[PDB]
Amino acid sequence: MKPHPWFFGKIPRAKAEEMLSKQRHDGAFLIRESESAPGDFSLSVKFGNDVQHFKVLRDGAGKYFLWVVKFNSLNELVDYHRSTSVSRNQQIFLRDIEQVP
Numbered sequence: 001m002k003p004h005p006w007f008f009g010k011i012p013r014a015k016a017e018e019m020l021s022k023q024r025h026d027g028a029f030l031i032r033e034s035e036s037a038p039g040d041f042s043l044s045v046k047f048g049n050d051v052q053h054f055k056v057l058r059d060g061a062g063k064y065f066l067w068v069v070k071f072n073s074l075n076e077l078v079d080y081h082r083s084t085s086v087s088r089n090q091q092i093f094l095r096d097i098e099q100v101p
């Protein structure tokens with residue numbers, strides 16, 4: 001197995017922006033522990049010359065979600081959005097960031 005190159009843990013929202021703005025592919029993303037919602041997570045995605053942010057929401061059942069579809073894990077939420085757009089207004093598919101070993 002191998003660890004997921006998308007979990008950055010505790011990193012400021014603005015830092016996620018600086019990092020993702022340097023990626024070249026739209027969809028480059030990362031999950032970070034929320035700064036406005038301590039104890040939760042946020043998803044930051046590169047799209048054009050901007051970095052969009054999404055709240056990773058939770059329900060009383062412990063599920064994770066962005067919109068209506070609910071997932072049992074962060075991993076499944078992430079993977080689902082590699083083939084279905086994370087945005088309703090735009091077609092944005094998640095793709096791992098390019099990192100040099």
Ligand SMILES: CNC(=O)[C@H]1[C@H](C(=O)N[C@H](C(=O)N[C@@H](CC(N)=O)C(N)=O)C(C)C)[C@H]1c1ccc(OP(=O)(O)O)cc1
Pocket residue numbers: 013033034035036037041042043052053054055056057065066067087088
């Ligand atoms: C300045 N405020 C924002 O960044 C708006 C961001 C937002 O609304 N994003 C759009 C959106 O419509 N999000 C939906 C879906 C979602 N799950 O975020 C929503 N607001 O419920 C998205 C299409 C770019 C919502 C946001 C606010 C905080 C946040 O966590 P954090 O950055 O850690 O403080 C993550 C996202």
